[PDB]
Design an enzyme around this catalytic site. Structure first.
Site, short mmCIF file in Angstrom:
data_model
loop_
_atom_site.label_atom_id
_atom_site.label_comp_id
_atom_site.label_asym_id
_atom_site.label_seq_id
_atom_site.Cartn_x
_atom_site.Cartn_y
_atom_site.Cartn_z
N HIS A 84 0.81 -1.21 0.00
CA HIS A 84 0.00 0.00 0.00
C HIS A 84 0.84 1.27 0.00
O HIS A 84 0.36 2.31 -0.44
CB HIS A 84 -0.92 -0.02 1.22
CG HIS A 84 -1.91 1.10 1.27
ND1 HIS A 84 -1.61 2.33 1.82
CD2 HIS A 84 -3.19 1.18 0.84
CE1 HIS A 84 -2.67 3.12 1.73
NE2 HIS A 84 -3.64 2.44 1.14
N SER A 122 -0.07 -0.98 -6.40
CA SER A 122 0.07 -2.27 -7.05
C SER A 122 0.90 -2.15 -8.32
O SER A 122 1.40 -1.08 -8.68
CB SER A 122 -1.31 -2.86 -7.35
OG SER A 122 -1.96 -3.25 -6.16
N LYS A 179 -14.47 -8.93 -9.06
CA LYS A 179 -13.48 -9.81 -9.66
C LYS A 179 -12.87 -10.74 -8.61
O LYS A 179 -12.66 -11.93 -8.87
CB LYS A 179 -12.39 -8.98 -10.34
CG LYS A 179 -11.48 -9.77 -11.25
CD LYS A 179 -10.48 -8.84 -11.92
CE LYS A 179 -9.49 -9.61 -12.78
NZ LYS A 179 -10.13 -10.19 -13.98
N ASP A 180 -12.61 -10.21 -7.41
CA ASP A 180 -12.09 -11.01 -6.32
C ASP A 180 -13.12 -12.01 -5.83
O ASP A 180 -12.77 -13.13 -5.45
CB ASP A 180 -11.65 -10.08 -5.19
CG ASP A 180 -10.24 -9.58 -5.36
OD1 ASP A 180 -9.77 -9.48 -6.52
OD2 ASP A 180 -9.59 -9.27 -4.35
N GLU A 223 4.59 -33.90 0.85
CA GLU A 223 3.74 -33.18 -0.10
C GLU A 223 4.56 -32.51 -1.21
O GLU A 223 5.75 -32.21 -1.03
CB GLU A 223 2.86 -32.16 0.63
CG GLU A 223 3.49 -31.60 1.90
CD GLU A 223 2.46 -31.21 2.93
OE1 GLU A 223 1.25 -31.42 2.68
OE2 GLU A 223 2.84 -30.69 4.00
C1 HEM Z 1 -4.60 -20.76 12.67
C2 HEM Z 1 -4.62 -21.63 11.65
C3 HEM Z 1 -4.46 -23.18 11.71
C4 HEM Z 1 -4.84 -24.04 12.65
C5 HEM Z 1 -5.60 -23.69 13.91
C6 HEM Z 1 -4.45 -25.38 12.26
C7 HEM Z 1 -4.69 -26.54 12.98
C8 HEM Z 1 -4.45 -27.82 12.54
C9 HEM Z 1 -4.70 -29.05 13.26
C10 HEM Z 1 -5.29 -29.15 14.69
C11 HEM Z 1 -4.33 -30.07 12.49
C12 HEM Z 1 -4.41 -31.58 12.82
C13 HEM Z 1 -5.80 -32.11 12.53
C14 HEM Z 1 -5.73 -33.12 11.42
O1 HEM Z 1 -4.66 -33.21 10.76
O2 HEM Z 1 -6.73 -33.85 11.20
C15 HEM Z 1 -3.84 -29.53 11.24
C16 HEM Z 1 -3.36 -30.26 10.17
C17 HEM Z 1 -2.74 -29.73 9.07
N1 HEM Z 1 -2.47 -28.39 8.87
FE1 HEM Z 1 -3.17 -26.86 10.00
N2 HEM Z 1 -3.80 -25.29 11.06
C18 HEM Z 1 -3.78 -23.95 10.71
C19 HEM Z 1 -3.23 -23.42 9.59
C20 HEM Z 1 -2.61 -24.14 8.62
C21 HEM Z 1 -2.01 -23.57 7.45
C22 HEM Z 1 -2.03 -22.04 7.19
C23 HEM Z 1 -1.49 -24.59 6.74
C24 HEM Z 1 -0.73 -24.61 5.39
C25 HEM Z 1 -0.32 -23.55 4.67
C26 HEM Z 1 -1.77 -25.81 7.47
C27 HEM Z 1 -1.41 -27.08 7.08
C28 HEM Z 1 -1.84 -28.26 7.65
C29 HEM Z 1 -1.71 -29.57 7.07
C30 HEM Z 1 -1.07 -29.91 5.72
C31 HEM Z 1 -2.25 -30.45 7.92
C32 HEM Z 1 -2.32 -31.97 7.69
C33 HEM Z 1 -3.73 -32.35 7.27
C34 HEM Z 1 -3.77 -33.84 7.03
O3 HEM Z 1 -2.80 -34.53 7.41
O4 HEM Z 1 -4.78 -34.32 6.45
N3 HEM Z 1 -2.45 -25.51 8.62
N4 HEM Z 1 -3.93 -28.16 11.31
C1 HEM Z 2 0.28 -15.98 3.02
C2 HEM Z 2 0.87 -15.51 1.92
C3 HEM Z 2 0.60 -14.14 1.24
C4 HEM Z 2 -0.45 -13.29 1.33
C5 HEM Z 2 -1.78 -13.42 2.11
C6 HEM Z 2 -0.16 -12.15 0.49
C7 HEM Z 2 -0.98 -11.07 0.29
C8 HEM Z 2 -0.91 -10.26 -0.82
C9 HEM Z 2 -2.00 -9.50 -1.39
C10 HEM Z 2 -3.45 -9.45 -0.85
C11 HEM Z 2 -1.54 -8.85 -2.45
C12 HEM Z 2 -2.38 -7.93 -3.35
C13 HEM Z 2 -2.85 -8.74 -4.55
C14 HEM Z 2 -1.97 -8.43 -5.72
O1 HEM Z 2 -1.27 -7.39 -5.69
O2 HEM Z 2 -1.97 -9.23 -6.69
C15 HEM Z 2 -0.13 -9.17 -2.60
C16 HEM Z 2 0.73 -8.71 -3.58
C17 HEM Z 2 2.08 -8.97 -3.61
N1 HEM Z 2 2.71 -10.02 -2.97
FE1 HEM Z 2 1.92 -11.13 -1.55
N2 HEM Z 2 1.08 -12.33 -0.09
C18 HEM Z 2 1.58 -13.53 0.36
C19 HEM Z 2 2.80 -14.07 0.02
C20 HEM Z 2 3.73 -13.48 -0.81
C21 HEM Z 2 4.94 -14.08 -1.31
C22 HEM Z 2 5.35 -15.53 -0.95
C23 HEM Z 2 5.56 -13.17 -2.09
C24 HEM Z 2 6.90 -13.22 -2.89
C25 HEM Z 2 7.85 -14.17 -2.83
C26 HEM Z 2 4.75 -11.98 -2.09
C27 HEM Z 2 5.02 -10.81 -2.76
C28 HEM Z 2 4.06 -9.95 -3.23
C29 HEM Z 2 4.28 -8.80 -4.08
C30 HEM Z 2 5.65 -8.36 -4.62
C31 HEM Z 2 3.11 -8.22 -4.31
C32 HEM Z 2 2.88 -6.97 -5.18
C33 HEM Z 2 2.23 -7.39 -6.49
C34 HEM Z 2 1.85 -6.19 -7.30
O3 HEM Z 2 2.24 -5.06 -6.92
O4 HEM Z 2 1.14 -6.36 -8.32
N3 HEM Z 2 3.64 -12.20 -1.31
N4 HEM Z 2 0.21 -10.03 -1.59
#
Ligand code: HEM
Ligand code: HEM
Ligand code: CDL
Ligand code: PC1
Ligand code: PC1
Ligand code: 3PE
Ligand code: 3PE
Ligand code: 3PE
Ligand code: 3PE
Ligand code: HEC
Ligand code: HEM
Ligand code: HEM
Ligand code: FES
Lengths: 380, 60, 164, 240, 77, 52, 380, 54
Positions: A201, A205, A227-228, A271
């Site tokens: 911001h 963008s 669009k979103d 994975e």
């Molecule tokens: C505040 C957010 C989150 C909470 C509270 C949470 C909680 C949990 C819990 C309790 C489990 C075990 C339950 C189960 O596997 O049946 C789980 C599994 C898992 N979580 Fe999360 N999680 C969160 C965010 C995320 C995020 C952001 C990711 C990946 C980017 C993620 C990736 C995974 C994966 C891959 C598993 C394995 C699922 C499976 O084995 O089928 N989690 N999560």
């Molecule tokens: C949980 C992961 C992420 C969230 C929630 C997030 C969030 C966002 C959002 C909402 C936007 C605006 C949408 C857009 O501009 O297209 C954005 C843009 C952007 N993100 Fe992320 N982001 C994440 C991860 C990342 C990663 C992994 C990278 C780079 C390695 C990154 C770099 C950027 C950049 C450079 C922009 C600007 C794009 C532009 O100006 O058009 N972000 N991000």
């Protein structure tokens, strides 16, 4: 009478950031992926919150609790499969976000790109701990493998990994601390994503043409709002058809068995994105070298904005670097497939050829491509 | 002769409160109608296999 | 404008239906699970209850006291009037079988359970705020706003009783 | 041999994208498991409360629960006692610990058959191929006692003798209990035991497919409607 | 809202020393204890008597509870 | 206190009664649609059928 | 060259919020309690993170896990007692925070005050659920009691209690869901504290004199930086002497036994910071009336800005309202003592008189005192 | 199952396997675990000393 939308402080912040935000008019569907990542982050927050409401973190009861969620809890199968396939969808959207930035030169926003790299770190760590949470065979063995990779560090790694393990192997202390860390880490992800959006911001963008978009700006509402919404619906379509028709297409069968410290699977296949990390690890045959190879393969995005030697920002008007970038996506796919495949010939030689190609393209071949492009366009 | 969407706009869609009211009423009726339609398609595509189909062989 | 707003209205109806189904599914996940519903049915309480003793078990989740009502206690409950209490309750209406009386220890002030074999009425004593209950489950002296509830039970032959 | 045999893709009744399981086959495979497969393999996650409303009715599943005995306690004196099982009880394990399972099965541990379809690659195809692929070993390999040839098991040597054959049990509905029929029924039952949410999941998938096929054109219509004012905008440059 | 403008102040002169040039505890006891006594004198009468009647009714409730638990010899006959 | 007691505010209020009442009916029908009241949904000629 | 502190975006936000924030010069030690509340919040975050790092949320293993933390884990007893006494000091700081707000006329910031009120609701819910967490006898019985007080609501209460129990009573589902909610809800508290500080920065800060402080304002650093540091150090003095010298005097002995549903406690009571609400709900002899009395007794804080009938903001020059305010504080102390005491003569009549006087002072006596004060100062 | 001499990691052995056996073999009253009884009874070690000597 005054306008509350610019008078009220929470409302004026929402107005200046999401409502009357000046945005380029020509951004494509590749710009919906940030909103998709935020929506998927909220979906995982709620879904894992319910999973933790019905889940206990203890080795003799973790798998039983997961089975109890799947069977006895109403729609708990839907909740858990939503969580897993949404983690898959989260990493799909994250990779498309990174690819958008690499193709359209959004890495020139240095602070935003570095915060994005930090977000990638936190998301990968969170997803690894979530994968080890259900206490499956592959979950426990992948945890042991990644912690031994951490133990490859000289003079610190052994004590550091006995510290991280809470003992001498992956056990109840490791599972409980990984549950705590996995539950808590997406809130740090959300706060750092607020910082990410703030840094974006500060400068606005980026348009796909890479030019100054201030000549033609549109408000974020209602154009990019609807669009979103459409992008959210399409991502929900893909995620929910995955959950409700192919819930194990992106999963792992060996994870559906109780974890055995004695028995081991013949293959360690985490994975997809961890398959990529495992292949870039398995490329070169040394422990510390492979650990540094994985670390540099992730930090190379943070190293990317210093490698921009071209006079043009986006790759829309740069055809040679388009070929190099799609070859880079090609050997991303190749390295993911090698990480999937076991360790024989020719998977080895394809592995180090893909690794050297990937690193040489990002380090050497891309700025040379930009220099050649500039000297063809009379810019060098 | 006003057309069908013309009458819908003149009666319901112009006022936002009536727009929300017909949205909620249509939500009720569409909810039940789609439930009946989807269930009918489901047991027609899976006729003779579900427990509600093979239930009468063991209930009585 | 009618056509465009009709398209918008049908979209909003679909989104509202989907959101209602999602929130209803998550609220159903909040609620009790299949094992908890399966454990709400009570098995045979057998005949291990001693004479004049009360046995505490888990009925409908809550603690339930099944007490062998003595003849003197039943006579005292019959002598105690139904109109002399805060609510109309009689011993014969409260207990179908006077040999064994099964009640749920859930008080009507804070949802507490009473102490077995205590109080000034010969029945139960809620110790959270100190209320006395007689053998009929009616409150005599205490802060309880209502009488003690009696769970629904079906009695088979004398060794088999089912609650809940 | 490190080479393994990939199981073929059998055309199951539930293989289709919107097609559910045959609950009569689930029932038949359940008594296949009960009269054949329950003496060795445990079932730690499937209960009679899951059996009701799917393949048996409530009274039948209740009586089927009381036909087996379940340890319960503690007693009034503080011991264990055997009582008739009910709908809330899980399926009885054949052995108390895996060490007893390895002792009764000469060093091989029979896995829990509650996630075996979701745990083995191929799934019910793998189970059917394993149960129907028993054959004499080829000339070149000799297997010691307690080991049997099976090309579908990795390593080709399994700790099971062939469990099923022609007329291994008597079906209650009069279906001829051939080996292939028994294997198909028990594979469908194992698929149900691994994923009891199959029919509800596919019904919800049909609902989701219809609703999003209704919503995506409409949401795209609103997107193009609100975006129309930009996509038809015309620009003109009029310098002096 | 920032230090650029908050109020309009005119003809006001402020003097201050350096913290390295003046003391940190200048007459901490001799000119500090009378200040505490002055503040106590100012706000002693509108603060203390509520807590005094707290102590009074607290003691009354405690001794009345003790007397209620104490038995009453109403049984002579 | 006496800001909303006058003829202008009274006629503004009675102009807004139909809109506020219609919004209240919207809230009521949406709430009973979300929560599925038996006491209301058993009397409408259609929706009562699926409860049985 | 540029000034990085005011040109870097995150750094200029930090500078405008906490470094170059114009603060009143004359704010006393009562103004340190907001910073103390934030620091106690962070302490609770870290300390409970370690507790959940070593904690198992299951009825078979909750009490054994707490014993394992207190004995087997290295100084996890110190972690647990820091958590408990930090919760107690959090409520001490909350009570002094709302005391400052009531006395110094800080409720005129209506948005900030309402955000603080809902924050108080959230903190109370978190602390109640965290007291449910160790699965002691009084812990489980207090959970049952407070949930049945929630069940007092007609036609909604029974079904909503069966909904929030996850079943038919307080069981494994209730304990696990309370664990998840207690872990997660302090982060919503932190986000609402960010909103709290945002509204306060929009509306400025109040002084004890209740006047316009713009004539004499000083930067927050280094003045209130070192003042808040001294406040944190005194807070750590009180917290650490409670942890290391008297760890159980604010606690509960009956919480050190496993939860027995058959055996009821002889004298049940919630923790000391729920005692005034428990006493007033005991005082009103009705279920719905009692729970409504509790809810409105915490909602009169939100009702406070509509009860200000004085032309002076702070109570520094309003002696009659100071007398009424100190009678009110005395009345909350009486309510705390009565909530500690059982239901016997004369605690019932003392509780009813205390609740009646508390509501009468907060709703009737204080505005009449303000009007009398204005008439005595001859403002009309 | 089998018997073995106790190591350092073993806890103190329970005299009864379940509390029901303790109540049956000790005439109804269940002896509580003396691991948190000083912290769980009001008075603590004073209460324990007075109960034993009183
Ligand atoms: C505040 C957010 C989150 C909470 C509270 C949470 C909680 C949990 C819990 C309790 C489990 C075990 C339950 C189960 O596997 O049946 C789980 C599994 C898992 N979580 Fe999360 N999680 C969160 C965010 C995320 C995020 C952001 C990711 C990946 C980017 C993620 C990736 C995974 C994966 C891959 C598993 C394995 C699922 C499976 O084995 O089928 N989690 N999560
Ligand atoms: C949980 C992961 C992420 C969230 C929630 C997030 C969030 C966002 C959002 C909402 C936007 C605006 C949408 C857009 O501009 O297209 C954005 C843009 C952007 N993100 Fe992320 N982001 C994440 C991860 C990342 C990663 C992994 C990278 C780079 C390695 C990154 C770099 C950027 C950049 C450079 C922009 C600007 C794009 C532009 O100006 O058009 N972000 N991000
Ligand atoms: C082929 C027949 C149709 C045809 O010729 O279409 C031409 C048309 C392009 O011609 P045009 O009208 O000159 O281009 C302007 C766009 O139509 C203007 O529309 P748009 O493409 O900008 O729409 C926004 C974008 C928004 O899309 C997203 O936000 C997608 C987000 C990413 C996908 C989800 C994440 C997970 C990905 C996992 C891999 O949506 C799409 O790209 C497709 C929307 C489809 C809606 C449902 C249709 C049934 O293409 C489409 O409309 C694409 C969809 C149909 C094919
Ligand atoms: C996601 C797709 C839908 C997006 C929202 C949308 O289109 O709103 C339409 C419009 C706003 O978009 P609009 O711009 O089409 O509004 C036009 C409004 N009329 C027709 C009156 C001129 O939303 C509403 O009018 C209110 C929607 C909610 C109604 C009240 C709740 C009903 C359920 C209660 C429970
Ligand atoms: C909104 C307030 C009313 C909600 C309500 O009564 O919902 C009934 C509906 C269910 O309707 P119902 O007709 O089944 O009523 C259930 C109430 N008893 C069992 C006492 C008859 O409840 C909910 O949806 C939960 C609402 C919680 C708030
Ligand atoms: C899939 C292929 C989609 C496609 O056709 O892409 C071509 C498109 C060309 O777009 P462009 O040339 O900028 O201009 C529009 C044409 N006038 O180019 C684009 O749409 C650019 C797409 C950029 C993002 C692609 C991401 C793919 C996945 C990458 C994963 C790995 C990323 C790196 C990780 C380290
Ligand atoms: C030289 C070709 C000329 C073609 C002329 C066609 C007619 C032109 C006039 C009519 C217009 C037709 C339509 C035009 C479309 C756009 C223009 C176009 O396609 O241009 C050709 C394109 C880009 O040209 P340019 O980049 O300038 O080429 C320089 C040489 N490198 O270049 C190309 O398409 C060539 C791309 C070749 C890519 C080969 C990659 C092989 C290796 C891939 C490895 C992937 C990773 C594998 C794993 C590695 C590790 C193990
Ligand atoms: C969100 C508000 C809080 C949760 C909902 C209210 C609640 O707690 O409801 C409890 C109740 C439990 O019901 P349940 O155990 O499923 O059995 C039916 C017996 N009444 O739950 C129910 O009866 C179901 C309530 C469903 C509410 C759905 C709301 C959808 C809103 C869509 C907006 C667009
Ligand atoms: C407390 C013990 C007494 C403390 C004391 O000495 O208070 C006196 C002090 C005087 O302050 P002031 O009138 O501003 O004097 C300036 C003149 N130089 O007066 C003050 O400091 C008044 C503010 C005291 C705030 C803390 C005491 C009350 C805490 C509980 C408040 C509960 C509110 C309701 C909560 C539930 C709802
Ligand atoms: C006792 C003789 C058993 C009978 C009856 C059944 N099974 Fe079995 N099973 C048993 C053992 C000792 C083993 C382990 C053998 C080994 O070499 O490891 C197994 C294993 C299986 C497996 C797992 C195979 C794998 O690849 O992991 C499956 C899928 C299996 N058995 C199927 C199965 C079915 C469906 C049965 C009921 C008809 C059944 N077995 C009966 C012991 C015994
Ligand atoms: C629960 C966690 C809370 C946190 C972390 C918090 C945080 C803060 C902070 C940091 C300040 C600035 C300190 C100061 O200006 O003196 C402050 C002031 C304030 N708080 Fe809170 N607060 C909380 C709860 C509350 C509650 C419960 C209330 C009232 C019911 C409240 C109302 C106020 C008000 C009115 C101010 C302004 C004080 C003034 O202007 O002098 N807050 N808060
Ligand atoms: C993310 C933040 C927090 C986490 C992870 C957390 C975690 C925990 C855990 C795991 C327990 C049980 C362990 C034990 O009691 O031995 C617990 C208990 C408790 N929590 Fe928290 N807590 C957090 C914040 C808070 C806050 C903000 C409060 C109060 C304002 C609080 C109040 C309590 C109390 C009073 C107990 C009881 C301790 C005892 O009885 O021994 N917690 N907490
Ligand atoms: S809860 Fe029983 S007397 Fe109060």
């Amino acid at each position: 009478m005054t306008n509350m939308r610019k008078t009220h402080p929470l409302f004026k912040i929402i107005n200046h950031s999401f409502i009357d935000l000046p945005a380029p008019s020509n951004i494509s569907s590749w710009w919906n992926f940030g909103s998709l990542l935020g929506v998927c982050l909220m979906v995982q927050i709620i879904t894992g919150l319910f999973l933790a409401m019905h889940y206990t973190s203890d080795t003799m009861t973790a798998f039983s609790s997961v089975t109890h969620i799947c069977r006895d809890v109403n729609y708990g199968w839907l909740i858990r499969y939503m969580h897993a396939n949404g983690a898959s969808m989260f990493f799909i959207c994250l990779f498309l976000h990174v690819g958008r930035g690499l193709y359209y030169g959004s890495y020139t926003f240095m602070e935003t790109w570095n915060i994005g790299v930090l977000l990638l770190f936190a998301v990968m760590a969170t997803a690894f701990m979530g994968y080890v949470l259900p206490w499956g065979q592959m979950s426990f063995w992948g945890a042991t493998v990644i912690t031994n990779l951490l133990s490859a560090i000289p003079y610190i790694g052994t004590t550091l990994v006995e510290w991280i393990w809470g003992g001498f192997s992956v056990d109840k202390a490791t599972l409980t601390r990984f549950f705590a860390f996995h539950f808590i880490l997406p809130f740090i992800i959300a706060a750092l994503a607020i910082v990410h959006l703030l840094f974006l911001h500060e400068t606005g963008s980026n348009n796909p043409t890479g030019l100054n978009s201030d000549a033609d700006k549109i408000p974020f509402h209602p154009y990019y709002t609807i669009k979103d919404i459409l992008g959210i619906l399409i991502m929900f379509l893909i995620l929910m058809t995955l959950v409700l028709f192919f819930p194990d297409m992106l999963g792992d069968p060996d994870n559906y068995m109780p974890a055995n410290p004695l028995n081991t699977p013949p293959h360690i296949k985490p994975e997809w994105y961890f398959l990529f990390a495992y292949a870039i690890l398995r490329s070169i045959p040394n422990k510390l070298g492979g650990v540094l190879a994985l670390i540099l393969s992730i930090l190379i995005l943070a190293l990317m904005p210093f490698l921009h030697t071209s006079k043009q920002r986006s790759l829309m008007f740069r055809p040679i670097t388009q070929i190099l970038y799609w070859i880079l996506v090609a050997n991303l796919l190749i390295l993911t497939w090698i990480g999937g495949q076991p360790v024989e010939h020719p998977f080895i030689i394809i592995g180090q050829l893909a690794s050297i190609s990937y690193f040489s393209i990002i380090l050497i071949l891309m700025p040379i491509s930009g220099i050649i492009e500039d000297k063809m366009l009379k810019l060098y | 002769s006003p057309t069908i969407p013309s009458r819908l706009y003149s009666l319901l869609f112009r006022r936002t409160s009536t727009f929300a009211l017909t949205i909620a009423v249509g939500a009720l009726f569409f909810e039940r109608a789609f439930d009946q339609g989807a269930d009918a398609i489901y047991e027609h595509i899976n006729e003779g296999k579900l427990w509600k189909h093979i239930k009468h062989k063991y209930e009585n | 404008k009618g056509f465009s707003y009709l398209v918008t209205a049908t979209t909003t109806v679909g989104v509202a239906y989907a959101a209602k189904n999602v929130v209803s599914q998550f609220v159903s996940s909040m609620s009790a699970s299949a094992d908890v519903l399966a454990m709400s049915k009570i098995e045979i309480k057998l005949s291990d209850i001693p004479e004049g003793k009360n046995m505490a078990f888990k009925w409908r989740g809550k603690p339930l006291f099944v007490r062998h009502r003595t003849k003197k206690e039943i006579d005292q409950e019959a002598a105690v009037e139904v109109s002399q209490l805060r609510d109309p309750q009689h011993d014969l209406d409260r207990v179908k079988k006077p040999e064994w009386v099964i009640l749920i220890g859930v008080c009507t002030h804070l949802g507490c359970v009473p102490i077995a074999n205590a109080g000034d009425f010969g029945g139960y004593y809620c110790p959270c705020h100190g209320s006395h209950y007689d053998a009929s489950g009616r409150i005599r002296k205490g802060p309880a706003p209502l009488n003690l509830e009696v769970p629904a039970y079906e009695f088979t032959s004398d060794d088999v009783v089912v609650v809940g | 041999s490190d080479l393994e045999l990939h199981p073929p893709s059998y055309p199951w009744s539930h293989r289709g994208l919107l097609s559910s399981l045959d609950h009569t086959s689930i029932r038949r495979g359940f008594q296949v498991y009960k009269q054949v497969c329950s003496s060795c393999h445990s079932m730690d996650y499937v209960a009679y409360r899951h059996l009701v409303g799917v393949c048996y009715t409530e009274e039948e599943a209740k009586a089927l629960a009381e036909e087996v005995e379940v340890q319960d306690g503690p007693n009034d004196d503080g011991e264990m006692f055997m009582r008739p099982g009910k709908l809330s009880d899980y399926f009885p394990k054949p052995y108390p610990n895996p060490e007893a399972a390895r002792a009764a099965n000469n060093g091989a541990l029979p896995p829990d058959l509650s996630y075996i379809v979701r745990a083995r690659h191929g799934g019910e195809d793998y189970v059917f191929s394993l149960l129907t692929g028993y054959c004499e070993p080829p000339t070149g390999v000799s297997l010691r006692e307690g080991l049997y040839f099976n090309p579908y098991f990795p390593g080709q040597a399994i700790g099971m003798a062939p469990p099923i054959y022609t007329e291994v049990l008597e079906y209650d509905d009069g279906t001829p209990a051939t080996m292939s029929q028994v294997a198909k029924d028990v594979a469908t039952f194992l698929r149900w035991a691994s994923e009891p949410e199959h029919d509800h999941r596919k019904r919800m998938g049909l609902k989701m497919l219809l609703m999003m096929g209704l919503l995506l054109p409409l949401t795209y219509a609103m997107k193009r409607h609100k975006w129309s004012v930009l996509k038809s905008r015309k620009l003109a440059y009029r310098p002096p | 809202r920032e230090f650029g403008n908050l109020a309009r102040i005119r003809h006001v002169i402020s003097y201050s020393l350096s913290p390295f040039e003046q003391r940190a505890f200048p007459s901490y006891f001799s000119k500090g204890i009378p200040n505490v006594l002055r503040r106590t004198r100012e706000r002693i009468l509108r603060v203390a008597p509520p807590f005094v009647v707290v102590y009074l009714i607290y003691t009354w409730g405690n001794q009345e509870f003790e007397q209620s638990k104490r038995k009453n010899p109403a049984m002579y006959e | 206190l006496s800001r909303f007691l006058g003829p202008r505010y009274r006629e503004l209020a009675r102009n807004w009664i139909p809109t506020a009442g219609m919004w209240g009916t919207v809230g009521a029908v949406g709430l009973v649609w979300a929560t599925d009241w038996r006491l209301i949904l058993d009397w409408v000629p259609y929706i009562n059928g699926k409860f049985k």
